[PDB]
Every structure is written in structure tokens, then in C-alpha cells.
Amino acid sequence: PRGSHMEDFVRQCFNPMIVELAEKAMKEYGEDPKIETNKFAAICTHLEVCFMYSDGGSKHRFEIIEGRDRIMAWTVVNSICNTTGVEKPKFLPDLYDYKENRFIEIGVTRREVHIYYLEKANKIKSEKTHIHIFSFTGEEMATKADYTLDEESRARIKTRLFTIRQEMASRSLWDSFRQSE
Ligand SMILES: O=C1NCCc2cccc(c2)OC/C=C\COc2cccc(c2)-c2nc1c(O)c(=O)[nH]2
Ligand SMILES: [Mn+2]
Ligand SMILES: [Mn+2]
């Protein structure tokens, strides 16, 4: 298969630490970034979005669950649950908001904004965990219209998503990413 050249953009566009974290996360599940480059980009973007989400809070407002070893990412959730008495989610979340004591599941969708929620709410029947979806076009959708974060932080988020979209369109690989889900 040799190289991919889209992974080159993925490496030149994202934080080196984010790239390494996404690479190790994909390799954990028997997937190759060198071939699944659209994946690679999707997991890198999800990682970055979760990171700006955690940064847009206060100081201890968010416990980051995504970007960890599966065993440790579960250990921290078990600790959170035995701490706050919150029922453990059936599926591993993304963040945990201490301020409002809820597991936030960050969704970075590619198709319609409604479809990602229609899938995520159906996946985790645990109605306690919160669900928040961002869009590449610049839209969003949260659970019970409770968007948790501010508005300028979320706006900076969607700005970053549209910047990544424009960068992908510059090198003419945008439809290849939109048609890979
Ligand atoms: O928590 C998560 N965990 C998934 C961890 C992972 C990383 C790499 C490879 C994997 C598993 O195995 C491959 C089979 C399918 C997965 O591929 C995609 C592709 C695009 C987005 C996501 C997953 C996505 N993952 C999560 C989210 O929370 C989320 O919003 N989106
Ligand atoms: Mn996740
Ligand atoms: Mn998620």
C-alpha cells in the first residue's frame, strides 16, 4: 500500500501529542492509520474537540476519559462512579463534568447533525450521561438543550472544525472524508 499522503496532512495539521494518542488508540483496536486515513483524521479531530472542551471549563470542571488506555480509562470512570454515586455508563464516555456531575459523550459528526444524536442516544440507554454533537458545517445539538459549556468556547470549537474542513478542501480530500462513514 506504500504511503497515503493524506496521513501527511493529518500529521502536519494536528498536535503531535494528539497524533500519537490517536495512533496508539487506533492500534489498540487492530486498525492501521496508514490505511484508515479518514479514520485517523476523524479520531484526531475528536481528540482535539474533546481537549478544547475540557480546556473551555474552569480548572477541575472536566475529567478527561478519552485519550487514555482502555483499562485506565475504565479505572478512572469506576473511581468517578464510586465517588459521586453515579451509575456507571454501559459504554466508555468522553468527559465527566464535576460541576453538574454527568458523563459527557462528545460527538463530532460528518453527516446530518440529527443522525449522530439519533444513533448516540440509542447506543447508550443510560439516559444519565449527556450527549453533545458538533458539526463541520458549524452546527451543534445537545441533550435537553443543555449545552454545558459557555458559547465563546463552543464557537472557537466550531471555528476550528471549519478550519480543518477548509484545509481538507484545499488539498481536495473533503468529499473523500465526507463519504467515509
Ligand atoms: O469513544 C470512542 N471510542 C473509540 C476508540 C477507537 C479508536 C480508533 C479505532 C477504533 C476505536 O476501532 C475502530 C472501529 C470503529 C471506530 O472508528 C471511529 C471513526 C470515527 C469516530 C469514532 C470512531 C468515535 N469514537 C469514540 C467516540 O466517543 C466518538 O464520538 N467517535
Ligand atoms: Mn470516546
Ligand atoms: Mn465521543
| Alpha-carbon span 111 to 137, nearest angstrom | 10
Composition of the chain by helix, strand, coil, percent to 5: 50, 10, 35
Burial 30-68 (b: 16+ CB within 10 A, else e): eeebeebbbbbbbbbbbbbbbbebbebbeeebbbbbbbb
- Length of the chain measured in residues: 181
d(CA 63, CA 67): 11
Q: Which residue has the cell 462513514?
A: 181
Q: Do the bridges between strand 102-108 and strand 95-97 make them parallel or antiparallel, or are there none, so unpaired?
A: antiparallel
Three-state secondary structure call for residue 88: coil
**CA 121 from centre of chain:** 16
- One-letter amino acid identity for 8? D
Contact 130, 105 (CB under 8 A): yes
Which DSSP state fits 124?
A: -
Find where cell 479518514 sits. Answer: 38
Amino acid at site 170: S
Gap from CA of 2 to ligand 3 centroid (Å): 31
3-state SS record for 40-54: HHHHHHHHHHHHHHH
CB of 97 within 8 A of CB of 69?
A: no
Spell out the domain ranges in the chain.
1-181
| CB contact set of 66 (below 8 Å; sequence gap of 6+) | 46, 47, 50, 73, 93, 94, 95, 106
Question: How many angstroms separate the CA atoms of 181 and 171, rounded?
Answer: 20
Cβ atoms of 161 and 136 closer than 8 Å: yes
- Residues annotated in the binding site for Mn(2+), as ranges? 46, 60, 66, 94, 105-106
Pocket residue to mutate for ligand 1, from 28, 37, 43, 92, most atoms within 8 A of Cβ? 43
Instruction: Give the three-state DSSP class for 176.
Output: helix
- Return the residue whose CA atom lies nearest to atom 17 of ligand 1: 39
Instruction: Tell how far the Cα of 59 is from the centroid of ligand 3, in angstroms.
Output: 21
Give helix then strand counts, H and E, for the chain: 7, 5
The Cβ of residue 118 has, within 10 Å, a number of other Cβ atoms equal to 10
Please list the active-site residues. 66, 94, 120
Is the distance from CB of 15 to CB of 48 less than 8 angstroms? yes
Q: Would you list which residues are annotated within the binding site for Mg(2+)?
A: 12, 46, 66, 94, 105-106
Residues with Cβ within 8 Å of residue 30, at least 6 apart in sequence: none
